[PDB]
């Protein structure tokens, strides 16, 4: 009755999406068609797991919270942190004494700065499109570069200063590329001092 992954991959016009469990459904052709319909999003990854979706975030320590910058430029973090560290020294004698004789105006910052930071300097955050669901590892897969450019980080590790002089700056594989040819797999790569002008095509290289 349940035909295997082979024949289901043969039947469907897009066998990219049909997985191990879809042969065990109650309507495989419909399910794999809806899995391959256009702008739908897939089922969350933890429907088959054993760990209740986030009880694997046990031992990892994380930062408390980064306030957004427009709120940090109100000084509320510095005043509130100083006030908590002042209140952490108080005994219960002075904690119940300043309950009946309160010294007020401890922060009393202003209202024009707050109304500025919520209306003048409001910042659009970094949102995401509707397909991009969340899984447990998501914020630590951050690794997700091009030929002809090298990052500052990689250039520090290589000892390769970014400059425009295409011959003293180049990557140390320049001499070998002059001898052996340009990349077999980048036919349109242009390298300054080889097949691109040295001072003109200073971006290290470019596909053109």
């Amino acid at each position: 009755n349940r035909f295997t992954v082979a024949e289901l991959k043969q039947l469907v016009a897009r066998p990219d999406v049909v997985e191990m469990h879809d042969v065990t459904a109650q309507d495989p052709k419909l399910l794999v068609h809806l899995k391959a319909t256009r702008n739908s999003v897939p089922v969350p990854r933890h429907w088959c797991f054993k760990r209740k979706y986030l009880q694997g975030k046990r031992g990892i320590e994380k930062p408390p919270f980064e306030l957004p910058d427009f709120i940090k430029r109100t000084g509320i973090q510095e005043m509130r942190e100083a006030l908590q560290e002042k209140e952490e020294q108080k005994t219960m004698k002075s904690k119940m004494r300043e309950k009946v004789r309160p010294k007020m105006g401890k922060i009393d910052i202003d209202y024009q700065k707050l109304h500025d930071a919520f209306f003048k300097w409001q910042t659009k955050p970094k949102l995401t499109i509707h397909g991009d669901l969340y899984y447990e590892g998501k914020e630590f897969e951050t690794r997700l570069k091009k030929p002809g450019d090298l990052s500052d980080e990689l250039r520090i590790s290589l000892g390769m200063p970014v400059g425009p002089n295409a011959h003293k700056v180049p990557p140390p594989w320049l001499i070998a590329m002059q001898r052996y040819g340009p990349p077999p797999s980048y036919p349109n790569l242009k390298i300054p001092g080889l097949n691109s002008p040295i001072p003109e095509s200073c971006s290290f290289g470019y596909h053109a």
Binding site: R58, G59, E61, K62, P63, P64
Partner: protein, 144 residues
């Protein structure tokens, strides 16, 4: 000095090797005893506890040989012969500068451990069976 007790981002406590969550102060230190913590401690005594220790410096008699230390030791009354070990200066109670040499350490139970500085890299072998002798009757200890 527990190296696995963690406090997380919300004011609870966690065993880090066990990966376990605990609500209050008293629920971690009642978990350190228990079959989850002890067996994970084993996966990651009595003779050490009952060592008699007066800490009495014996008398050594160093002497330049050529082809040796002579420690007079009062009675142990046990079968176990005195033991030597070569130890580095890297770990110490005060940890001060100039660490970088080796000590030939000698010990026996009731009484104090003795150390001998070695500045040369190699001259002898600080081994137990190859190069020690125990005159248990007169109670002088040997090592060359």
């Amino acid at each position: 000095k527990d190296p696995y007790f963690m406090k997380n981002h919300l004011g609870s406590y966690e065993c880090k090797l066990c990966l376990t969550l605990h609500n209050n102060e008293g629920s971690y230190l009642a978990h350190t005893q228990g079959k989850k913590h002890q067996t994970n401690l084993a996966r990651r005594v009595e003779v050490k506890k009952f060592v008699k220790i007066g800490r009495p410096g014996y008398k050594v008699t160093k002497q330049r040989d050529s082809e040796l230390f002579q420690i007079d030791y009062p009675e142990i009354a046990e079968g176990i012969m005195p033991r030597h070990r070569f130890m580095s200066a890297y770990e110490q109670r005060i940890e001060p500068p100039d660490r970088r040499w080796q000590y030939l350490l000698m010990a026996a139970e009731p009484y104090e451990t003795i150390a001998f500085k070695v500045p040369s890299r190699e001259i002898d072998k600080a081994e137990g069976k190859f190069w020690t002798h125990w005159n248990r009757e007169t109670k002088q200890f040997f090592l060359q």
